[PDB]
Amino acid sequence: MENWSALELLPKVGIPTDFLTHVKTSAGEEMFEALRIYYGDDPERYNIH
Amino acid sequence: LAEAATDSILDNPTTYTTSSGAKISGVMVSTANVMQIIMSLLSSHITKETVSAPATYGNFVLSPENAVTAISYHSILADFNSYKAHLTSGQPHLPNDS
Fold first, then answer.
1. Under a CB-based contact definition with an 8 Å cutoff, are residues B13 and A44 in contact?
2. Long-range contact list for B17-21, CB < 8 A, 24+ apart?
3. Distance in angstroms (rounded) separating the CA atoms of residues B83 and A32
4. Which long-range contacts (CB under 8 A, 24 or more apart) does A34-38 make?
5. Using CA atoms, how far apart are residues B65 and B62, in angstroms rounded to an integer?
6. Which of A7, A27, A41, B20 could join A32 via S-S bond, C-beta 3.0 to 4.6 A?
7. What distance in Å separates the CA atoms of residue B22 and residue B55, rounded to the nearest whole number?
8. CA Rg, chain A, in Å?
9. Is some CB atom of chain A closer than 8 A to the CB atom of B65?
């Protein structure tokens, strides 16, 4: 249980949290997962690109 | 000897783990004689365990970014409004070997 989470500071910076879901739905969960792997966001499942 | 080694940039946390949650840190290799001496001398700390290891080799994966470079080249090279692969209906799809 974290001190505070990155999502909480998004409204502070000026980006609403619901916008993340907008991007996710726009990407389509296929290209989104491919890109999320590519950016190294999932250590359990990574390959050299 | 084990402590002095620096860790690697890549390390999958799910691979090479024992039956318990313990993570394997590395491997010691030596000739048969050295291993016999160690296993006799330090038998208390030695133990035989089952280890989950990668079943198969890793794959070649093509970076999603290089699609953007190709599309930029086509933007320069293709005829006026002749190129159409960059826009489509439905879910977007990059060519992949998954």
1. yes
2. B17/B51, B17/B52, B18/B49, B18/B50, B18/B51, B18/B52, B19/B49, B19/B50, B19/B51
3. 24
4. A34/B64, A34/B94, A34/B96, A34/B98, A35/B64, A38/B63, A38/B64, A38/B65
5. 9
6. A27
7. 19
8. 13
9. yes
Give the three-state DSSP class for B61.
coil
Token pair for B44 = 């208390």
Q: Which of B7, B8, B12 to mutate to test the interface with A (most CBs of A within 10 A)?
A: B12
What Å resolution does this PDB entry report? 3.0
Report how far residue A4's alpha carbon sits from residue B41's, in angstroms, rounded to the nearest whole number: 49
Contact list in A for residue B94 (CB cut-off 8 A) is: 31, 34
